[PDB]
Amino acid sequence: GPHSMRYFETAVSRPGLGEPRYISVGYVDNKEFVRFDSDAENPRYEPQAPWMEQEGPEYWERITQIAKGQEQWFRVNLRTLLGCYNQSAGGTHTLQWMYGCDVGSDGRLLRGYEQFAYDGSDYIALNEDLKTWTAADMAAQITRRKWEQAGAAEYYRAYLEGECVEWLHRYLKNGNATLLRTDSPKAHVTHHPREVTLRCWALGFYPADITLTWQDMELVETRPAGDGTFQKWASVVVPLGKEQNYTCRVYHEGLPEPLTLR
């Protein structure tokens, strides 16, 4: 199983209601492990996974000081962006940043990611080479030139290849009981008079990656079920009495043999 660490950082302005709200959420694969929220009483990073009880007070203090500095970087860059786009104060605006690393099943680095969005569309993103930038509009073309001159990409590349990978290795080991487990899906089919709708359900599985096929198709994005497992359904509309010709297939890391059901 390959693994990833990813952070999701968002600031959103709320003019006349106070300063922008800053939130940072960290994930290993699809497990949330830390979270900062500027609207909490006593904003700090807090653990959301049991393996993060291993880290000491120095770890929490240092990443909470990063969040306090990062909050101000998002608030000033929101205010810069209003002037770049000649926008009035008073409108709601959003700055997003997603970044992280992917490793193979042997732990070696597969790729890194740094991507920014203003008001929910691309702004600037670092290419797969971890060296050059893709600017999505006229403002981002100016940032790209300034960031090429300042060598921004070198600071991100050092993080993505070093710190990001080294912490992801530490979290996979400290949380191996949660993160390296395999919970195989429990599947069933439901029958809905309509035509007729056949719905193949997969419940109780871990990790989230799955394939559901009917042998066209309604489905939902794989979704968290509230206790750290995932679920998914896929449906087909079939002819009103000949539904035993149809077969639901499920592929998962915990099924050496895929399930077949009807």
Binding site: I63, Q70, G83, T143, Y155
Partner: peptide, 15 residues
């Protein structure tokens, strides 16, 4: 472990 504080601002005013 998150990324450190972003070193550079967007600076998208132009001339």
């Amino acid at each position: 472990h998150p990324g450190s504080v972003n070193e550079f601002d967007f600076g998208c005013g132009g001339s």
